[PDB]
Amino acid sequence: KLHKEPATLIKAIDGDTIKLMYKGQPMTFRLLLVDTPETKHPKKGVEKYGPEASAFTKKMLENAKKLEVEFDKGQRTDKYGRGLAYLYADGKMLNEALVRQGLAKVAYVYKPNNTHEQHLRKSEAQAKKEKLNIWS
């Protein structure tokens, strides 16, 4: 089964890409199953809710007592060398929190890295129903 391991924040780059110390080395992590709006985007600069998502992630991680990374059952890195993972702050999944707040949408899903897909789509369906942020 999936398992959580400890990590240490280095810097949040934006809503869904975070630099962490993992196993003694700085690594960039990309959150599994979610896409936050871009703040860096080549074509457009900041997408709507980009800055909001980015500060949500930054605040949640910076104020955490403990951070943990959870790899899924498929590829653990993407072609850019980023770790692919679920991030937890004090036991709360960042990926879900963003979706639940309408600050991210559920990604394109690549089996078999899709263990928590059902749960996040249920939180996305609730954020839409509530018309939050991106769903506003």
Residues in the annotated binding site: 16, 35-36
Q: Is 121 a catalytic residue?
A: no
Of 109, 97, 129, 119, the closest CA to residue 16 belongs to 97
The answer to whether 76 touches 23, Cβ cutoff 8 Å, is: no
Hey, what are 118's tokens? 């059902």
Catalytic residue among 47, 82, 117, 121: 82
Neighbours of 134 (CB within 10 A): 22
* Positions at the binding site for Ca(2+): 16, 35-36
Catalytic residue among 38, 52, 68, 96: 38
Is there a catalytic annotation at residue 62?
no
Q: Examine the residue annotation and report whether 96 is marked as an active-site residue of this protein.
A: no
Q: Which residues are catalytic?
A: 30, 38, 82
